[PDB]
Amino acid sequence: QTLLDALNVRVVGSGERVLVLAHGFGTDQSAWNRILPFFLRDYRVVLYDLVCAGSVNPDFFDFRRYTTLDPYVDDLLHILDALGIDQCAYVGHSVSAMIGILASIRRPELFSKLILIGASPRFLNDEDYHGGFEQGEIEKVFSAMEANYEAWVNGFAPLAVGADVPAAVREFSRTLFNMRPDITLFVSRTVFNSDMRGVLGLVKVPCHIFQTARDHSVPASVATYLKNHLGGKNTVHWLNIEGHLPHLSAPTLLAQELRRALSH
Ligand SMILES: O=c1[nH]c(=O)n(-c2ccc(O)c([N+](=O)[O-])c2)c2ccccc12
Identify whether 215 is a catalytic site residue. Answer: yes
Resolved by: X-ray
**Domain range list for the chain:** 1-264
Task: Please check whether residue 185 is in contact with residue 146, taking contact to mean a CB–CB distance below 8 angstroms.
Answer: yes
Mutate to test the pocket of ligand 1, among 28, 187, 191 (most ligand atoms within 8 A of CB): 191
Q: Can you tell me the distance from the alpha carbon of 235 to that of 254, in angstroms, rounded to the nearest whole number?
A: 16
- Selecting from 3.40.50.1010, 3.40.50.1820, 3.60.40.10, 3.30.70.100, what CATH number does the domain 1-264 have? 3.40.50.1820
CA neighbor of 51 nearest in space, from 90, 83, 8: 8
Complete DSSP assignment for the chain: -HHHHHTT-EEE-S-SSEEEEE--TT--GGGGTTTGGGTTTT-EEEEE--TTSTTS-GGG--TTT-SSSHHHHHHHHHHHHHTT-S-EEEEEETHHHHHHHHHHHH-TTTEEEEEEES--S--B-BTTB--SB-HHHHHHHHHHHHH-HHHHHHHHHHHHH-SS-HHHHHHHHHHHHHS-HHHHHHHHHHHHH---GGGGGG--S-EEEEEEES-TTS-HHHHHHHHHHSSS-EEEEEEEEESS-HHHH-HHHHHHHHHHHHH-
Torsion of CA 55, 195, 219, 187, to 10 degrees: 20
Q: Can you tell me the distance from the alpha carbon of 58 to that of 17, in angstroms, rounded to the nearest whole number?
A: 33
The residue from 30, 94, 120, 188 that is catalytic is 94
The answer to whether the CB of 176 is under 6 A from ligand 1 is no
Contacts of 217 (CB under 8 A, 6+ apart): 94, 118, 120, 123, 132, 160, 244
For residue 213, the cross-strand partners are 242
Phi/psi of residue 251, nearest 5 degrees = -65, -40
The answer to whether the CB of 149 is under 6 A from ligand 1 is no
> How remote is the CA of residue 95 from the centroid of ligand 1, in Å?
9
Identify whether 94 is a catalytic site residue. Answer: yes
Phi/psi of residue 29, nearest 5 degrees = -65, -20
The answer to whether the CB of 141 is under 6 A from ligand 1 is yes
Complete DSSP assignment for 182-214: HHHHHHHHHHHH---GGGGGG--S-EEEEEEES
Report how far Cα 196 is from the mean position of its chain's Cα atoms: 14
C-alpha dihedral sign at 243, 251, 171, 142: negative
The residue from 93, 208, 237, 244 that is catalytic is 244
